[PDB]
Design an enzyme around this catalytic site. Structure first.
Site, PDB file in Angstrom:
ATOM      1  CG  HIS A  60      -0.282  -0.020   2.520  1.00 33.74           C
ATOM      2  ND1 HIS A  60       0.041  -1.181   3.219  1.00 33.74           N
ATOM      3  CD2 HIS A  60       0.100   1.009   3.296  1.00 33.74           C
ATOM      4  CE1 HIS A  60       0.577  -0.854   4.383  1.00 33.74           C
ATOM      5  NE2 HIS A  60       0.618   0.483   4.456  1.00 33.74           N
ATOM      6  CG  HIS A  63       6.523   1.600   6.107  1.00 37.74           C
ATOM      7  ND1 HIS A  63       5.918   0.609   6.877  1.00 37.74           N
ATOM      8  CD2 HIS A  63       5.526   2.372   5.617  1.00 37.74           C
ATOM      9  CE1 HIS A  63       4.604   0.767   6.835  1.00 37.74           C
ATOM     10  NE2 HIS A  63       4.340   1.853   6.072  1.00 37.74           N
ATOM     11  CG  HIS A  90       4.779   6.444   6.158  1.00 40.21           C
ATOM     12  ND1 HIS A  90       4.783   6.079   7.472  1.00 40.21           N
ATOM     13  CD2 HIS A  90       3.622   7.104   5.951  1.00 40.21           C
ATOM     14  CE1 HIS A  90       3.674   6.505   8.046  1.00 40.21           C
ATOM     15  NE2 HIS A  90       2.928   7.114   7.124  1.00 40.21           N
ATOM     16  CG  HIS A  92      -0.078   8.810   3.692  1.00 40.94           C
ATOM     17  ND1 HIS A  92      -0.929   7.771   3.975  1.00 40.94           N
ATOM     18  CD2 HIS A  92       0.730   8.956   4.764  1.00 40.94           C
ATOM     19  CE1 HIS A  92      -0.625   7.272   5.161  1.00 40.94           C
ATOM     20  NE2 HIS A  92       0.379   7.989   5.672  1.00 40.94           N
ATOM     21  CD  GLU A 102      -3.224   9.569   5.360  1.00 43.74           C
ATOM     22  OE1 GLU A 102      -3.765   8.573   4.833  1.00 43.74           O
ATOM     23  OE2 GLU A 102      -2.550   9.544   6.420  1.00 43.74           O
ATOM     24  CG  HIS A 115       2.406  10.781   8.152  1.00 46.26           C
ATOM     25  ND1 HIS A 115       1.332   9.979   7.819  1.00 46.26           N
ATOM     26  CD2 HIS A 115       1.955  12.056   8.101  1.00 46.26           C
ATOM     27  CE1 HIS A 115       0.288  10.751   7.577  1.00 46.26           C
ATOM     28  NE2 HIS A 115       0.639  12.020   7.742  1.00 46.26           N
ATOM     29  CB  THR A 195      -3.818   8.078   8.574  1.00 42.67           C
ATOM     30  OG1 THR A 195      -2.648   7.563   7.941  1.00 42.67           O
ATOM     31  CG2 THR A 195      -3.498   9.280   9.433  1.00 42.67           C
ATOM     32  CG  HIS A 196      -2.360   2.699   7.404  1.00 48.09           C
ATOM     33  ND1 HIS A 196      -1.857   1.566   8.015  1.00 48.09           N
ATOM     34  CD2 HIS A 196      -1.282   3.434   7.040  1.00 48.09           C
ATOM     35  CE1 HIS A 196      -0.534   1.637   8.055  1.00 48.09           C
ATOM     36  NE2 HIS A 196      -0.155   2.770   7.464  1.00 48.09           N
TER      37      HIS A 196
HETATM   38  N1  LIG Z   1       0.023   7.145   8.744  1.00 47.01           N
HETATM   39  S1  LIG Z   1       0.497   7.149  10.281  1.00 47.01           S
HETATM   40  O1  LIG Z   1       1.623   8.013  10.385  1.00 47.01           O
HETATM   41  O2  LIG Z   1      -0.660   7.420  11.086  1.00 47.01           O
HETATM   42  C1  LIG Z   1       1.036   5.515  10.692  1.00 47.01           C
HETATM   43  C2  LIG Z   1       0.240   4.441  10.334  1.00 47.01           C
HETATM   44  C3  LIG Z   1       0.648   3.155  10.636  1.00 47.01           C
HETATM   45  C4  LIG Z   1       1.859   2.916  11.287  1.00 47.01           C
HETATM   46  N2  LIG Z   1       2.323   1.573  11.474  1.00 47.01           N
HETATM   47  C5  LIG Z   1       3.441   1.321  12.375  1.00 47.01           C
HETATM   48  C6  LIG Z   1       2.953   1.393  13.799  1.00 47.01           C
HETATM   49  N3  LIG Z   1       1.765   0.539  13.994  1.00 47.01           N
HETATM   50  C7  LIG Z   1       1.866  -0.149  15.296  1.00 47.01           C
HETATM   51  C8  LIG Z   1       1.118  -1.474  15.379  1.00 47.01           C
HETATM   52  C9  LIG Z   1       1.927  -2.640  14.807  1.00 47.01           C
HETATM   53  O3  LIG Z   1       1.063  -3.431  13.976  1.00 47.01           O
HETATM   54  C10 LIG Z   1       0.216  -4.278  14.769  1.00 47.01           C
HETATM   55  C11 LIG Z   1       1.031  -5.376  15.410  1.00 47.01           C
HETATM   56  C12 LIG Z   1       2.267  -4.809  16.065  1.00 47.01           C
HETATM   57  C13 LIG Z   1       3.087  -5.624  16.845  1.00 47.01           C
HETATM   58  C14 LIG Z   1       4.264  -5.136  17.392  1.00 47.01           C
HETATM   59  C15 LIG Z   1       4.622  -3.824  17.196  1.00 47.01           C
HETATM   60  C16 LIG Z   1       3.812  -2.994  16.438  1.00 47.01           C
HETATM   61  C17 LIG Z   1       2.649  -3.478  15.839  1.00 47.01           C
HETATM   62  C18 LIG Z   1       1.579  -0.356  12.825  1.00 47.01           C
HETATM   63  C19 LIG Z   1       1.377   0.452  11.546  1.00 47.01           C
HETATM   64  C20 LIG Z   1       2.637   4.019  11.669  1.00 47.01           C
HETATM   65  C21 LIG Z   1       2.231   5.314  11.372  1.00 47.01           C
HETATM   66 ZN   LIG Z   2       1.118   7.958   7.508  1.00 48.65          ZN
END
Ligand SMILES: NS(=O)(=O)c1ccc(N2CCN(CC[C@@H]3OCCc4ccccc43)CC2)cc1
Ligand SMILES: [Zn+2]
Length: 256
Positions: A60, A63, A90, A92, A102, A115, A195-196
């Site tokens: 999608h 990173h 990263h 968008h 966003e 971001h 945001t996702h």
């Molecule tokens: N667009 S934004 O800037 O809002 C943004 C969106 C998504 C992220 N991601 C990284 C941090 N998030 C933490 C959760 C992650 O995934 C779930 C399992 C699990 C396990 C162990 C450790 C972490 C995690 C995942 C997606 C970062 C920034």
């Molecule tokens: Zn983001």
């Protein structure tokens, strides 16, 4: 989950009921409705370029991940008592230049958004633990206005040829992402979310008032990345921006 018709932001509530929560990001910042807050300190970023690790195609988006084992790369100040440790940046972007950001400011959509994500290493031991916590994440958002080529993006863009398809990754070392930030660190802040998916309401947003530039051609390079695995039919990553969500009584504070 994705950004297509069938898996996109309108469908997200089916799998992630927090989608319709009270602290969802992004939001439209209404400048007339913000509030100058006196106790906001300036933003201090101090990043070590040796903490840059790896660039990854996640299908999608892409990173740039950082080593987060110690406090070599930290965000301080603004609305925070605590120190936050850099772990990734990263972008968008949208189908065309007309949209892509966003966050919107007074309903104006920009072409892309940077971001820079950090986790609360004062209070929690890992990203894993911090990620789901009210005070756990700090993301800086920079709006990207279509215009002149941004030469500070070059090392990022130059790396994309080695991670063209989903799952591909490469070393990405010797990079300080504060070089991507605009000269002025005047900002807005509000409590919010990823945001996702999984969309955790864990993020204190730091939205820069000053934009950075990006060319139409630099945006073409992002959109030329592929959501499919090597050997499948080419599916360009056209867009990965979520629509703006209702404030539901939250207050956007301004540093300025
Ligand atoms: N667009 S934004 O800037 O809002 C943004 C969106 C998504 C992220 N991601 C990284 C941090 N998030 C933490 C959760 C992650 O995934 C779930 C399992 C699990 C396990 C162990 C450790 C972490 C995690 C995942 C997606 C970062 C920034
Ligand atoms: Zn983001």
């Amino acid at each position: 989950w994705g950004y297509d018709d069938k898996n996109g932001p309108e469908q997200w509530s089916k799998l992630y009921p927090i989608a319709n929560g009270n602290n969802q990001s992004p939001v439209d910042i209404k400048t007339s409705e913000t509030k100058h807050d006196t106790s906001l300190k300036p933003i201090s970023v101090s990043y070590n370029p040796a903490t840059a690790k790896e660039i990854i195609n996640v299908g999608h988006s892409f990173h740039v991940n950082f080593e987060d084992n110690d406090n070599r790369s930290v965000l301080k100040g603004g609305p925070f008592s605590d120190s936050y440790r850099l772990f990734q940046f990263h972008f968008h972007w949208g189908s065309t230049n007309e949209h892509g950001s966003e966050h919107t400011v007074d309903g104006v959509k920009y072409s892309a958004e940077l971001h820079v994500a950090h986790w609360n290493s004062a209070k929690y031991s890992s990203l894993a633990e911090a990620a789901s916590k009210a005070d756990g994440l700090a993301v800086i958002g920079v709006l990207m206005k279509v215009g002149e080529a941004n030469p500070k993006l070059q090392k990022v863009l130059d790396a994309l040829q080695a991670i063209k398809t989903k799952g591909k990754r490469a070393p990405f070392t010797n990079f300080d992402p504060s070089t991507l930030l605009p000269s002025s660190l005047d900002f807005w802040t509000y409590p919010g979310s990823l945001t996702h998916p999984p969309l955790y309401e864990s993020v204190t947003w730091i939205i820069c008032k000053e934009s950075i530039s990006v060319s139409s051609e630099q945006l073409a390079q992002f959109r030329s990345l592929l959501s499919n695995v090597e050997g499948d039919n080419a599916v360009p990553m056209q867009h990965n921006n979520r629509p703006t969500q209702p404030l539901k009584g939250r207050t956007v504070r301004a540093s300025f």
